[PDB]
RNA sequence: UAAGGUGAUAUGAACCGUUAUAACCGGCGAUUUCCGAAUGGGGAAACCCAGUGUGUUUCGACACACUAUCAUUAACUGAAU
RNA sequence: CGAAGGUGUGCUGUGAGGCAUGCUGGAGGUAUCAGAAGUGCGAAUGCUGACAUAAGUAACGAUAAAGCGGGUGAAAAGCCCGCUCGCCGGAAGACCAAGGGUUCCUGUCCAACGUUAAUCGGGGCAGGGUGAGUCGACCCCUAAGGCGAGGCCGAAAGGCGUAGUCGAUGGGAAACAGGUUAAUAUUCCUGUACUUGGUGUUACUGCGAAGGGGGGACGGAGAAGGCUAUGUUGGCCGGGCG
RNA sequence: UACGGUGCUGAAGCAACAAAUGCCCUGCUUCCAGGAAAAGCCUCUAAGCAUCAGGUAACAUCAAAUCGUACCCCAAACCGA
């Protein structure tokens, strides 16, 4: 088949890139929980 | 304050090996790791103090196609230049 | 004589990588020269020898027939084709006859060019497929399967390297040999020149056998 | 440790920089780029040498 | 503090100390790139684009420092009135 | 100089259990009495790992047919080449975005991997490759739309929203034809061109506002028509008579 | 000529018919549904400054940065386990 979620990079970084998860304190929950997990996945970036 | 020796420190290596070394690394046209943004300037004027080439076409291209350097482990590609200039002379070697 | 193949050219395109990591050992196949001119020798042996015949042949023809190649007296040539082709050496330079030096010198150079070219047309050396000889493989761990070397796209590398090895320093060697005699030397300035070279290809032969009969030191393809 | 150099002034630190930072990768770090080093150790003091240039610039105030 | 050393896998290469001058430890210092609260803007940070100063300039161009917001305070000026 | 265990055999205890003992094994294990328990599994379609079956059973993925002769090599339905056959062809051609983004060339390698055979592949593994004032992106301008000092709302947290700031799927300088590597391309080269903007110089000269005016600047349909790439021919020019 | 490939050359090189869904053309026309914006772009003054500076024209000069460019791309390079 052909599935349900597809690329868009035309929003990616500004769906959760650095100033898009910093942007939110609650997406700095993400980053708070990744200053609490030391996960490689963060905003899924470098 | 008028130029910098900083980009007269641009030499990092001539390319080599198989095809494309032929006049691409020799004669006019030469290809070589040159800085990282080059400058298109003191990379044509640092060979104009060395061969007097005003450089037939100053070009740049960052160099691409896959990581290696343990390609059967994980690989890392730091990225670099092929100068890929055409020099206007190549005769004072 | 001995500062006449000291030089560094060197090519690595031969590939290996085995046990990667750069203080583990190394990672390549590691060919080089540093020494050159190596089948153009037999030519200048011939060129000097030809003059040995003429000085012999002419003197033989002189006191048992007709001067055709020169006039002698006092043992050696004094005149003729045989004089202008005689070698000045023995203990010191001859600066008395500059035209003799010029003709003899030109004569020897062109004689050396001649047997070098006949070392093209009968018995020489190859580059084109000496090129292609190596690449079937490089050196493998076993594991890395080369194509840094390219089986053709190498002919030229060879045809830049070889000659000067049948010609192209035949001229130069014949020159070097001639001026080696204008200085003069004991045992012959040219004979020293040939001797040093013969000795160098020799010396290493005396030494040569010992290391790789442990099965070879390796990893250079 | 403690026991090196002679200190260098910033009227001649000048001269040092034109020989192991510049026009040294045109002959030794060009010729690193052209290998043949059985004298690996020499190279390491092209670095660690002009790295002392700017130590004895900021530490010693150019002295 | 020291006779052995030259970070690891990484053996090599070359060297070093040449035993107190390697190396180590401890103090101090230096650099400490790029980003990043980041703060000249932009901005999908590790990047785009920039200014202002202070310089240089060969006049082609080129270095160098400064330039955030928001709070608190002071000082100067000062509408509708 | 043989602990534990793994592991045979004989004796024993009701059993829980115990003994004797061989091998292997190559290290440790351990009275009594006394102390303390994570102290014993056949069923939970239990958990978890290892290990079965069917069964060599099913299966080996789209019919757009290939066939042949050489080659390589140990070996070929598939590798290599060639020669003969079929099929798509407003696609099954040829070129792109996105995305991949190296999958690419080149050179190699065959183990694994490709749905088999494979020397072969985008496999595996080495190298090599994408070059621009004029082409594009960075870049200038605007949409939806966002943000938003200050501002106006709201326990905190926090909202609405200005001056502004951001923001394509829309609008802002110019180059082409040849010719070129197995990797290049308006990018390289060649030939012949193009452009804009800064500088400078010169000559003349009133210049002068986030201002003002002007202007960008526009639908759909429909009715035509014109036109040319061009297409087709003839002619032409060359070659050829099966 | 390796046998991989390289060197050497060049005739015709038009016209008719017949052309395009290509274009003149944002044209024209028509119809109501009602058809961006800004920049680019032009011009005027304004305060000012005032010939100056600027401007305008010609000419000349210089500059024209930072990156992409391989290749699949209906496909073994996208997606589909």
Swiss-Prot record, chain A:
GO-annotated molecular function: structural constituent of ribosome
A Pfam short name: Ribosomal_L34
Sorted UniProt keywords: Ribonucleoprotein, Ribosomal protein
Superkingdom, taxonomy of origin: Bacteria
Stated family: Belongs to the bacterial ribosomal protein bL34 family.
Complex formation: Part of the 50S ribosomal subunit.
Name the record gives this protein: Large ribosomal subunit protein bL34
Gene: rpmH
UniProtKB/Swiss-Prot annotation, chain B:
Keyword RNA-binding: yes
An example Gene Ontology CC term for this record: cytoplasm
Described function: One of the early assembly proteins, it binds 23S rRNA; is essential for growth. One of the proteins that surround the polypeptide exit tunnel on the outside of the subunit. Acts as the docking site for trigger factor for Ffh binding to the ribosome (SRP54) and to nascent polypeptide chains.
Subunit structure: Part of the 50S ribosomal subunit. Contacts protein L29 and trigger factor. Might also contact SecE and probably does contact SecG and SecY when the SecYEG translocation complex is docked with the ribosome.
InterPro entries (alphabetical): Nucleotide-bd_a/b_plait_sf, Ribosomal_uL23-like, Ribosomal_uL23/eL15/eS24_sf, Ribosomal_uL23_CS
GO molecular-function terms, A-Z: rRNA binding; structural constituent of ribosome
Annotated protein name in UniProt: Large ribosomal subunit protein uL23
Ribosomal protein is among the record's keywords: yes
Keywords for the protein's UniProt record, in alphabetical order: Ribonucleoprotein, Ribosomal protein, RNA-binding, rRNA-binding
GO biological process, one term: ribosomal large subunit assembly
Organism for this UniProt entry: Escherichia coli (strain K12)
UniProt family annotation: Belongs to the universal ribosomal protein uL23 family.
Pfam family, one: Ribosomal_L23
Swiss-Prot record, chain D:
Listed GO MF terms: rRNA binding; structural constituent of ribosome
GO biological process per UniProt: cytoplasmic translation; ribosomal large subunit assembly
Key word Hydrolase present: no
UniProt keyword annotations, A-Z: Ribonucleoprotein, Ribosomal protein, RNA-binding, rRNA-binding
Gene3D superfamilies in the cross-refs: 6.10.140.1970
Xref: CDD domains: Ribosomal_L29_HIP
UniProt cross-references to PROSITE patterns, sorted A to Z: RIBOSOMAL_L29
Pfam families (UniProt xref): Ribosomal_L29
Alphabetical list of HAMAP family matching this protein: Ribosomal_uL29
Protein task: Binds 23S rRNA. It is not essential for growth.
Similarity comment: family membership: Belongs to the universal ribosomal protein uL29 family.
Subunit structure: Part of the 50s ribosomal subunit. Contacts protein L23, trigger factor and protein nascent chains. Might also contact SecE and probably does contact SecG when the SecYEG translocation complex is docked with the ribosome.
Name by which UniProt lists this protein: Large ribosomal subunit protein uL29
Organism field: Escherichia coli (strain K12)
